[PDB]
Design a protein around this ligand. Structure first.
Ligand SMILES: Nc1nc(=O)c2ncn([C@@H]3O[C@@H]4COP(=O)(O)O[C@H]5[C@@H](O)[C@H](n6cnc7c(N)ncnc76)O[C@@H]5COP(=O)(O)O[C@@H]3[C@@H]4O)c2[nH]1
Lengths: 177, 177
């Protein structure tokens, strides 16, 4: 029916509510320790199309550089379950034009897969509007979450382009203020 | 409305479909390498109550021993995202009566949390039947999944007891055949 609403709240309480409070603290460690990546976490949400696993192939201008400090903790009986993220370099005309923490909204690929299996009661036409609904309920969550306080920026998009440009646009404008 | 159905399918396509095919292979590595833990993955699903993060406190007789070999791979733009599980010793009258890979159905604690936040449209009364629905749709998935082929056993339960006994019951009976 409306699976996206539930998955958005799962994205909050099982991930971002966990890693947002300590995110900025762990970026400082990397930058301070390494000779710079900006503070926010940038989450890609392709609405129409699917979610690749390697951004470098989704857009060659998005080159991955290094990892962050891992985040560990016991969650649901697994001692030292570790949450890790990735830092990507974004190029423009062969020039390093940005650096930041970039990743896809993993639940989006769950939706894409569920629209294939039969007994999920989820048709391939509903896919777009569910991706839209997911992108939006998550927006409502982050505006009034105490954990989200200039922590992350949603990058929604739909493709009939170049992704590296789309993320650059969000980077360039958060530096404006 | 009916959030559990969606979360069950998220549990399959984002976790068990990933780690079940290689699970048994990675258990052999541990046992063969370490001087024994049985092959299945045992997933706890408390329906009424919540999901603690440390089983040793949920039941003192469930003592954690060691970890498995980590499982890594790129998923949604995070290079070398790692999935790890935990191996627990289960005691009986102060005696080591079992060893296996044990964990909670993480989505269950997502449900428990969502029943608190206001704008999730999810009341605290619906909690039990949603946990029931989650336990069941997942059963339907594992019966006809090609990835699940004597890989894991669901341990559902509801508490007005001793958990270590409940898991032992499932261990003792899978050894009967
Ligand atoms: N991008 C990203 N990186 C992460 O490290 C990460 N960890 C969680 N999540 C996303 O947040 C939510 C996690 O909630 P939960 O863990 O309760 O459900 C998860 C979780 O129960 C199960 N799962 C995934 N990894 C593990 C794990 N290491 N241990 C147990 N369960 C896991 O599979 C469900 C769906 O995961 P994803 O569908 O890949 O995206 C998850 C999910 O939407 C992550 N997203």
């Amino acid at each position: 029916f409306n699976v996206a609403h539930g998955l958005a709240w799962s994205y909050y309480i099982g991930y971002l509510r966990l890693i947002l409070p300590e995110l900025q603290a762990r970026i400082r460690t990397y930058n301070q320790h390494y000779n710079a990546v900006s503070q926010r976490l940038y989450i890609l949400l392709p609405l129409d199309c699917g979610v690749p696993d390697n951004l470098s192939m989704a857009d060659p201008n998005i080159r991955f550089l290094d990892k962050l400090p891992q985040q560990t903790g016991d969650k649901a009986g697994i001692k030292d379950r570790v949450y890790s993220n990735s830092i990507y370099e974004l190029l423009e005309n062969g020039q390093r034009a940005g650096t930041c923490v970039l990743e896809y909204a993993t639940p989006l690929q769950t939706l894409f897969a569920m629209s294939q299996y039969s007994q999920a009661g989820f048709s391939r036409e509903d896919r777009l509007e569910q991706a839209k609904l997911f992108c939006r309920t998550l927006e409502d969550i982050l505006a009034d979450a105490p954990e989200s306080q200039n922590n992350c920026r949603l990058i929604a998009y739909q493709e009939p382009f170049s992704l590296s440009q789309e993320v650059l646009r969000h980077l360039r404008q958060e530096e404006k203020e």
